[PDB]
Amino acid sequence: YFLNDKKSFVHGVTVKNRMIRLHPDGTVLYGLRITTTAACMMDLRRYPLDEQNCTLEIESYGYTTDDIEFYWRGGDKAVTGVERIELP
Amino acid sequence: YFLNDKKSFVHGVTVKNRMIRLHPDGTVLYGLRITTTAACMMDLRRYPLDEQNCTLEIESYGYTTDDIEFYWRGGDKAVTGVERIELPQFSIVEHRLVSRNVVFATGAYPRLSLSFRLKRNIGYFILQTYMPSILITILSWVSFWINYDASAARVALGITTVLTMTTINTHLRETLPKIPYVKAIDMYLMGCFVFVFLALLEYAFVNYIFFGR
Amino acid sequence: MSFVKETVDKLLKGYDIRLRPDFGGPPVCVGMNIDIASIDMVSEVNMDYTLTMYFQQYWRDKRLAYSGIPLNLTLDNRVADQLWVPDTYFLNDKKSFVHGVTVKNRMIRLHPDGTVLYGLRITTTAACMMDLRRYPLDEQNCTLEIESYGYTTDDIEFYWRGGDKAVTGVERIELPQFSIVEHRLVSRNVVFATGAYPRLSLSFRLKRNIGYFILQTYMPSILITILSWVSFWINYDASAARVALGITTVLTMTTINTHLRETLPKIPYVKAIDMYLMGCFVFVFLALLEYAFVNYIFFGRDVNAIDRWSRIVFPFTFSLFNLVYWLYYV
Amino acid sequence: YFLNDKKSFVHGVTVKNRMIRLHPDGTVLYGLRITTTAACMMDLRRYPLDEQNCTLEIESYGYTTDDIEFYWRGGDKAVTGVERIELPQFSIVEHRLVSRNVVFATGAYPRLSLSFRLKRNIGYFILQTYMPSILITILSWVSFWINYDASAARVALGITTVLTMTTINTHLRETLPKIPYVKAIDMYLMGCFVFVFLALLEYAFVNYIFFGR
Amino acid sequence: DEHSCPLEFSSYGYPREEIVYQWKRSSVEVGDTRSWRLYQFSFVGLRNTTEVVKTTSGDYVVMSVYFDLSRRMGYFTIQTYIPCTLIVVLSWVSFWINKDAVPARTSLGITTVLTMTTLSTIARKSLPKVSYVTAMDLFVSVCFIFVFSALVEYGTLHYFVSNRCLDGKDCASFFCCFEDCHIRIAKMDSYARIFFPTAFCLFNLVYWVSYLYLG
Amino acid sequence: GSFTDFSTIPSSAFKAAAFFVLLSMVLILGCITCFSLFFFCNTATVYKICAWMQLLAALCLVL
Amino acid sequence: QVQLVESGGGSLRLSCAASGHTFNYPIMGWFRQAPGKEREFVGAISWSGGSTSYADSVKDRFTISRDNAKNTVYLEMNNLKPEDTAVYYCAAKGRYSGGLYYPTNYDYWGQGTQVTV
Amino acid sequence: QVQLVESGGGSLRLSCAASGHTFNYPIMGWFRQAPGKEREFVGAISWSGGSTSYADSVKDRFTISRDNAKNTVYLEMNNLKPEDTAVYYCAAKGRYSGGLYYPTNYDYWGQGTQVTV
Ligand SMILES: *[C@@H]1O[C@H](CO)[C@@H](O[C@@H]2O[C@H](CO)[C@@H](O[C@@H]3O[C@H](CO[C@H]4O[C@H](CO[C@H]5O[C@H](CO)[C@@H](O)[C@H](O)[C@@H]5O)[C@@H](O)[C@H](O[C@H]5O[C@H](CO)[C@@H](O)[C@H](O)[C@@H]5O)[C@@H]4O)[C@@H](O)[C@H](O[C@H]4O[C@H](CO)[C@@H](O)[C@H](O)[C@@H]4O)[C@@H]3O)[C@H](O)[C@H]2NC(C)=O)[C@H](O)[C@H]1NC(C)=O
Ligand SMILES: *[C@@H]1O[C@H](CO)[C@@H](O[C@@H]2O[C@H](CO)[C@@H](O[C@@H]3O[C@H](CO[C@H]4O[C@H](CO)[C@@H](O)[C@H](O)[C@@H]4O)[C@@H](O)[C@H](O[C@H]4O[C@H](CO)[C@@H](O)[C@H](O)[C@@H]4O)[C@@H]3O)[C@H](O)[C@H]2NC(C)=O)[C@H](O)[C@H]1NC(C)=O
Ligand SMILES: CCCCCCCC/C=C/CCCCCCCC(=O)O[C@H](COC(=O)CCCCCCCCCCCCCCC)COP(=O)(O)OC[C@@H](O)CO
Ligand SMILES: CCCCCCCC/C=C\CCCCCCCC(=O)O[C@H](COC(=O)CCCCCCCCCCCCCCC)COP(=O)(O)OC[C@@H](O)CO
Ligand SMILES: *[C@@H]1O[C@H](CO)[C@@H](O[C@@H]2O[C@H](CO)[C@@H](O[C@@H]3O[C@H](CO)[C@@H](O)[C@H](O)[C@@H]3O)[C@H](O)[C@H]2NC(C)=O)[C@H](O)[C@H]1NC(C)=O
Ligand SMILES: CCCCCCCCCCCC(=O)OC[C@H](COP(=O)([O-])O)OC(=O)CCCCCCCCCCC
Ligand SMILES: CC(C)CCC[C@@H](C)[C@H]1CC[C@H]2[C@@H]3CC=C4C[C@@H](O)CC[C@]4(C)[C@H]3CC[C@]12C
Ligand SMILES: CC(C)CCC[C@@H](C)[C@H]1CC[C@H]2[C@@H]3CC=C4C[C@@H](O)CC[C@]4(C)[C@H]3CC[C@]12C
Ligand SMILES: CCCCCCCCCCCCCCCC(=O)O
Ligand SMILES: CCCCCCCCCCCCCCCC(=O)O
Ligand SMILES: CCCCCCCCCCCCCCCC
Ligand SMILES: CCCCCCCCCCCCCCCC
Ligand SMILES: CCCCCCCCCCCCCCCC
Ligand SMILES: *[C@@H]1O[C@H](CO)[C@@H](O)[C@H](O)[C@H]1NC(C)=O
Ligand SMILES: CCCCCCCCCC
Ligand SMILES: CCCCCCCCCC
Ligand SMILES: CCCCCCCCCC
Ligand SMILES: CCCCCC
Ligand SMILES: CCCCCC
Ligand SMILES: CCCCCC
């Protein structure tokens, strides 16, 4: 789940934008297309000459580290497509 | 159910934010991530110098106190995250938890209540809404130190101060116009308007008495 | 009737819904066909457009093939859920849905040769980033991108059924502030790490209507500047008159600019209309400064040379500014 | 289904607002309570003196005229409540019911159409836009009768009339739907603006000829 | 204004011959009115009704509860009614201002017109965009006409001063004052000083009495 | 029905009748204002001014 | 309603002028009917003047323009063939009528001009 | 369309100038093709500047930047090694084209500049 989300959904046209892929070994790959509205507290005391740090926090809802352990697959190369982000 | 709720939901991405945890002694814990748009009365009579007291009332729907009894687990430690709240315009002064039984002639129903007191920050209002009105009134007072025969100058000063006051009051639509109630800012603006009006009327008296007859 | 019923039940029987047609064989081939109904409001603030259409996917499935029953069947709501359909999705959509009232606007028609036709009525809000640098003299390019979600080109191929006639109903669009100059249909194979996915693009080119802005932005600013030039012909010793004229022209320019940026979309970066308005503002400010210079030099500290120079240079400079602006931005 | 709908739903309180009724002969009556947002393209060139024709198009989705046919039960009395409808900006002058068979490549599909003709009422427009515009245009002509030597008075009057016309134009668009194309109200405002502009420009000629040289 | 907002319900499909509704006892119960979120209106009680509405599907028993609401007038008073009257008085100030102060009186009149124009927009900030005229809009329009008339009066004064049968006789002399006619235009200021307040007071009296009592 | 909302008035004849009665009201209130003008202007002139204005109000009311 | 009138009839320019409630019938279509043959869809034009649609046979030969300032549609022809000899009609279509190629969907027709080559 | 032209072939600065519809093709990437070796991605720059991406082989050595004064993108090639010899090309990529590292996703390619050292 996303601990900072205020409203999130999975796109559902034409079908539900999900995906599961299985391999000959036991591995499973699970993909979703998700739009979220995430809270980002802003320090606007220096507005408009300000710099903001926004975050997205991903966590398990009821499993501890004894049961589930997260990690970025690929390290710093895990998140892709940041160059596509453009704002006015 | 939350009595004063208008619209609430349980988050559902990637899965429903709902957990059930059992214990060997038969005990059960149920957790939910809920976003509730609860409704609280506000006394906007002293706005922007007000201090709201909003509440969340938790109540059982079907069962009475004879079947279900609500209580706060941990006494005063039941609610956490008041430090984590960060509102831009409001500032939390105190939070309270009250458990009781609403008494009906038919029976008694349990209820819990979590209340927050939210003072409003007045620096922004003192900077934007109040200070220009005071400066405009002080500018309107400038007419008394100008020569009494400077008719064009004094009349232009007074009437343009009135026009500026009206301009401020109309484009003050940011300060709660859509819902109309008499607040405190309205009284202050009305007083400043009356003062500038009297300032112009003063030169009216001066001109008629001393320049004509 | 019962013959049709039991035959349809048999067609359902023995059908694997998690498996596409010809899993080990060549890829399935899906022909897309869009019938536009309308393009609703197009937002510069959100950089998106809302589009309503009838979206049709045509393909062949030998599993759902029957002999006899010459009429082409029509599954509606329930057994339709028990058939494989492509996992097509719109890459750039922000919010979309299939219309529900009175019934789900969906249709599945099976021809006796195993062919399947799947129609949907879809409204979708799609992202359209806009180059608002020549606004309101801008020309925009919006697109709708259709792609398979999980299957690469080796499993599914997409195409435009009917070629350039695949998309119809473009003439039906009646946007108020935009005119559709051209539209195009494109098919590509975008390459990801997994492989080459199919992609279709339906592109529209939009040209904004400009008479609104000519009426309410460019004309009042020009008239206010021309009014500001009247000080040069007003007598130089008319201090109250000239000062009131100049400062009230400045006030009117600020009023126009402020209420204009209030009524217009937010657009938090520079445009062309802003440059024009700032030029007019600078012109009226310079006119007031010119009077200040006149008042200090003469009457302070046979028309005077400063006003004689102003009368000829200010209209001339404003004309050059207009020429440069219009040539640069047109 | 409604062909020109943008968003619609069936009300679901307290239960689904739906009804099935059977008759012994075999007739079936099927009722729903539907709120729908339909598209109505508008020719706002003559705004606010315009007249709109907003239609609702009812059509079968899958079936064709070889399978299903439509008709208005009760004929012209198939739609009611139109006389009871009230709107803040429009009056329903007339309503019409039509039945057609739209032709497509697949075949001819049935269609029903319910059209309303709406006439906009102009009292508030006359009160706030047309009236003060005319009055300010008239006020701009007082400079003609004001003395030619008095320059401050005439210049202030003309330029303040221009400012007031600009204020009226701007604040109008702070109320009017953006409607972004030319309209009759915009043409009238531009005409009044040009009139006050020429009235102010007249004193420029007067002052130059009879004081400057 | 006062309103009677309804809340009406019935069975959707079952006519009067199939389902019949009845109030249990004593209409409906209302909690303490202070807890209610009504800020623009004041509660003036409620009432209940039941009827048989006739529809094409059949006859249906429709129950209804009307809540009476009365608008509060303080906010609109301070926002519009007091500033408009004060601006009209400031328009009247021109008459007491000396006639020779041409820039002063002209600027005063035209800026009062501008201020009335500015105040005229805040009226419809809390109402649906309607086509007809409300009482506050009518009041603002009358005030605008008053200030316009004051400025026109000064214009006329400045122009005219800067320039320079049985039982009666003659039929016209008796029905007109064409004799002699000038002098009175100079005393136009003295006439207006008492004419304008009397007109505005008469308008206020008739307007307020009609809107409060006869309606 | 209300005078401010001409959309609700049943007919143009009703609109015209209301307009004429309103003109009569305005003219008679013009007299009740010129009762102020009795202070300064000459009595014969003010009396004739209301005589004509009341005649006009009467004609408007008859129409 | 709308009243349509066709005029005109190798640079040939036909003109279809519309009067009345032209807004309610935005799309305007040109058809041709040679002797013996039935009506065939030559072209179609929208309200705003963009998104013109021509038939396969005469896609590039003809060009259709529009100007709502006078409510007239111009059908230009560059190179004419001797199969083009026919009676040319103009018609108007509603906003939710249907397809463009079917004359039944069009409501108001014109008397139609004659062209021979 | 868009046309890309390279120029500028210790520290070597390579400037790729773009002329045309640059907005429709926001991202610009750099590729190198040594003789006998396949075309290989090196880095990429977004539309609004920043968000630079680089290949693993040339990390912390090459730094791409853009000023858009004349629609120019500068590779600013530094720490030149003998293995870093190849024909360098600048290419344009649309808003929705896919991954940066694949030449097929890039629409328009420049002429290409040679560097041999
Ligand atoms: C708001 O704006 C909208 C904008 O469109 C406007 O809409 C139009 O409204 C007018 C009425 O004012 C509609 O006109 C009517 O249409 C009737 C139906 O026409 C179709 O069907 C005709 C055949 O009959 C149908 O119905 C019978 C049963 O009644 C059924 O058996 C048939 O199978 C069929 O379904 C058909 O003829 C007609 O036209 C086609 O075919 C003829 C063939 O000769 C051809 O000439 C046409 O070119 C066309 O191809 C169409 O397909 C129609 O019956 C009706 O007729 C009236 O006049 C005739 C004589 O002219 C009388 O005989 C008859 O009794 C009627 O009095 C009339 O023409 C029009 O269709 C609307 N347009 C659209 C697109 O919906 C609204 O009116 C506006 N309203 C407001 C409130 O502002
Ligand atoms: C925002 O505003 C709301 C609305 O006013 C406040 O809500 C109230 O909070 C107060 C406390 O702050 C509550 O008062 C408390 O009730 C407790 C429980 O009452 C029990 O006892 C009664 C009588 O026997 C039973 O009927 C009931 O069912 C319960 O069993 C009391 O224990 C509290 O005690 C004080 O008074 C008693 C006398 O009654 C003394 O004996 C105690 O020693 C002590 O002095 C107190 O009376 C009140 O009920 C709440 N009202 C509502 C509607 O919730 C919020 O507190 C306020 N929030 C902020 C932050 O300001
Ligand atoms: C409920 C029933 C109604 C009751 C109310 C009844 C109202 C009663 C007043 C009537 C005034 C008109 C009466 C006829 C006036 C006749 C004239 C008269 O009386 O004498 C003159 C005025 O006297 C006077 O004080 C009269 C001065 C005018 C006073 C009127 C003020 C305006 C009244 C606003 C309307 C309020 C009432 C209605 C409200 C709904 C003064 O001569 P004087 O030679 O010295 O001058 C110098 C000259 O030579 C000029 O240089
Ligand atoms: C000494 C001081 C002097 C101060 C000045 C004194 C003058 C006072 C000011 C204005 C008077 C206004 C009179 C206007 C008369 C027109 C009244 C009218 O209603 O005309 C409508 C339009 O006409 C039509 O269709 C077509 C005809 C349109 C013509 C509309 C007239 C606008 C001009 C306005 C005149 C401005 C003043 C001019 C004074 C010089 C028709 O009804 P309709 O069902 O649609 O309404 C429903 C809607 O109002 C819902 O409430
Ligand atoms: C089930 O429906 C399909 C259509 O979804 C029927 O087949 C299609 O029928 C149409 C109409 O005949 C064919 O279109 C054209 O027909 C004319 C006839 O003169 C011909 O000249 C054209 O060249 C064209 O063929 C269409 O090609 C045909 N093909 C498809 C896509 O299925 C089918 O007959 C229906 N089955 C039954 C018996 O209900
Ligand atoms: C009216 C606009 C607002 C005016 C506000 C009040 C300002 C003062 C108005 C005084 C009007 C008046 O009494 O006019 C008298 C003069 C006499 O001039 P002359 O013939 O002695 O040179 O007459 C003239 O100068 C000639 C007549 C000029 C007025 C013509 C108006 C025509 C309007 C109808 C459309 C043609
Ligand atoms: C001081 C004196 C001169 C003021 C005169 C004000 C008069 C002329 C004003 C006040 C109230 C006004 C009316 C108020 C409401 C409406 C309804 C609208 O749909 C048409 C205009 C109409 C009918 C107005 C006409 C002008 C009117 C009668
Ligand atoms: C001072 C003199 C010259 C003119 C005064 C005229 C005044 C009193 C007139 C002008 C317009 C009039 C209003 C016009 C319309 C209505 C609506 C009606 O439902 C009640 C009366 C009411 C509210 C009128 C009250 C009186 C009124 C305000
Ligand atoms: C809405 C129109 C208002 C018109 C205002 C007219 C103001 C001037 C009236 C002058 C009256 C006195 C002089 C009349 C001279 C004459 O007509 O002969
Ligand atoms: C809100 C009140 C406005 C003013 C009302 C004034 C009414 C009285 C009219 C006085 C007219 C005579 C003034 C001059 C008298 C003198 O000669 O000193
Ligand atoms: C809330 C109590 C009822 C409403 C009271 C409104 C008072 C408005 C007074 C405005 C002044 C009118 C008379 C002015 C006379 C010069
Ligand atoms: C519930 C209170 C509503 C406000 C009622 C008006 C209060 C008085 C406002 C100030 C009036 C000033 C009039 C100008 C002359 C002193
Ligand atoms: C509701 C606004 C009331 C405004 C009152 C302003 C003060 C009026 C004082 C009276 C001025 C005239 C006195 C002299 C008359 C001869
Ligand atoms: C409301 O309904 C009840 C029950 O039917 C009835 O007794 C009562 O008279 C009605 N009216 C009021 C005002 O309560
Ligand atoms: C704020 C009012 C105007 C201040 C006048 C200052 C007077 C200085 C007297 C020496
Ligand atoms: C607006 C009221 C102005 C009054 C001027 C002075 C009256 C006479 C004082 C003796
Ligand atoms: C810029 C507008 C001012 C025009 C003044 C023209 C004066 C002409 C004198 C013959
Ligand atoms: C920004 C434009 C300035 C023009 C100066 C004449
Ligand atoms: C575009 C017209 C400009 C005129 C400047 C004098
Ligand atoms: C809008 C054109 C006005 C022309 C006035 C002479």
mmCIF file of C-alpha atoms in Angstrom, chain C residues 2 7 32 39 52 54 67 86 123 133 157 160 168 171 176 178 180 197 199 206 210 227 234 258 261 278 306 321:
data_model
loop_
_atom_site.group_PDB
_atom_site.id
_atom_site.type_symbol
_atom_site.label_atom_id
_atom_site.label_comp_id
_atom_site.label_asym_id
_atom_site.label_seq_id
_atom_site.Cartn_x
_atom_site.Cartn_y
_atom_site.Cartn_z
ATOM 1 C CA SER C 2 -33.218 -24.173 -27.682
ATOM 2 C CA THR C 7 -25.072 -24.713 -29.413
ATOM 3 C CA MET C 32 -9.443 -1.445 -34.556
ATOM 4 C CA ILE C 39 -14.676 15.980 -28.259
ATOM 5 C CA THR C 52 -16.391 10.017 -26.518
ATOM 6 C CA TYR C 54 -17.562 3.820 -30.167
ATOM 7 C CA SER C 67 -21.413 -24.798 -38.181
ATOM 8 C CA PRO C 86 -7.652 -8.430 -26.151
ATOM 9 C CA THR C 123 -15.663 8.126 -22.754
ATOM 10 C CA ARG C 133 4.286 29.720 -25.894
ATOM 11 C CA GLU C 157 -0.584 -7.557 -33.812
ATOM 12 C CA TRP C 160 -6.418 -0.123 -38.531
ATOM 13 C CA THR C 168 -14.870 8.111 -38.795
ATOM 14 C CA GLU C 171 -16.448 16.069 -38.946
ATOM 15 C CA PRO C 176 -15.877 26.224 -29.667
ATOM 16 C CA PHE C 178 -10.596 25.070 -31.684
ATOM 17 C CA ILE C 180 -9.577 20.545 -36.404
ATOM 18 C CA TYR C 197 4.629 -3.956 -28.165
ATOM 19 C CA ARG C 199 0.835 0.712 -30.820
ATOM 20 C CA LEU C 206 -6.153 21.880 -33.550
ATOM 21 C CA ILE C 210 -8.357 34.295 -32.359
ATOM 22 C CA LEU C 227 -5.321 57.554 -25.101
ATOM 23 C CA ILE C 234 -2.439 68.416 -24.080
ATOM 24 C CA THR C 258 -5.175 41.635 -13.798
ATOM 25 C CA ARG C 261 -5.179 36.855 -16.132
ATOM 26 C CA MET C 278 3.694 44.147 -20.730
ATOM 27 C CA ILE C 306 10.360 67.091 -25.793
ATOM 28 C CA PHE C 321 6.746 47.007 -31.564
#
